Structure 1
Amino acid sequence: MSELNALLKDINGSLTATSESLERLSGIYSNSPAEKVSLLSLKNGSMLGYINSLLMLIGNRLDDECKDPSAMDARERSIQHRVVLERGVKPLEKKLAYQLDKLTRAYVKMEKEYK
């Protein structure tokens, strides 16, 4: 059994597993006035884009032609998303971490009181 055959099967298992789990994540988001934290909303979007850039590297490599085996454009997109998450979002939410925990605790006590 060829090495490529084992590899392509592995991608097929990963892609279908991710797709089913993507189906679940989309449903809960669709299920969800409530206003979200703009920083935390951005934190979601940046790392979500990081996965697409990773998947874009998957797409560039999967193509039999491999015109861009390095996947530079996918590389750059992943870099931009990764760069912002680690050093841009993280220090700010560390400053905001104390206040965020207070509100989440504040909601939890109310929910316990209601029940």
Structure 2
Amino acid sequence: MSELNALLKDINGSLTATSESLERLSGIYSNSPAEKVSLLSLKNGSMLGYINSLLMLIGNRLDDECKDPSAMDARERSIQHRVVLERGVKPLEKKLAYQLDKLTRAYVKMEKEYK
């Protein structure tokens, strides 16, 4: 077997796994007034774009033309999405980490009480 054929097969298996998980992940979100914390919401959105940037890097490479093999535009998005997760969000959530635990613990006791 050619190296490309084995490689392409590996990518094919990855996508159907990711797509099926995306199918599951989209379903639960659609299943879910409850007001959402903004900080973690951005942190969720930030890494999603990072995954898209990784996939955009994948897509750029796969094009047989390979006009931009470095995937500069895809990379820069990943750089931006990676920066916000590491430098901006993490210090804030760490400062906010205790009060998050208290509320989550607060509900868990209530849910047990309700049951």
TM-score range, shorter chain: over 0.9
Q: Deviations over 1:53-104 (max 9, x none)?
A: 0000000000000000000000000000000000100000000001000000
| Unaligned residue ranges in structure 1 (runs of 5+) | none
Measure the CA separation in 1 of the matches of 2:17 and 2:81. Answer: 24
Match of 1:85 in 2: 85
Could you tell me the TM-score, scaled by structure 1's length? 1.00
Measure the CA separation in 2 of the matches of 1:8 and 1:90. Answer: 36
Measure the CA separation in 1 of the matches of 2:111 and 2:96. Answer: 23
Identity of aligned residues (%): 100
Measure the CA separation in 2 of the matches of 1:107 and 1:41. Answer: 20
Could you tell me the TM-score, scaled by structure 2's length? 1.00
Match of 2:98 in 1: 98
Measure the CA separation in 2 of the matches of 1:89 and 1:50. Answer: 14
Measure the CA separation in 2 of the matches of 1:35 and 1:85. Answer: 22
Measure the CA separation in 2 of the matches of 1:36 and 1:43. Answer: 12
Aligned length: 115
Match of 1:16 in 2: 16
Q: CA deviation at 1:106?
A: 0.2
SS in 1 for 2:69: coil
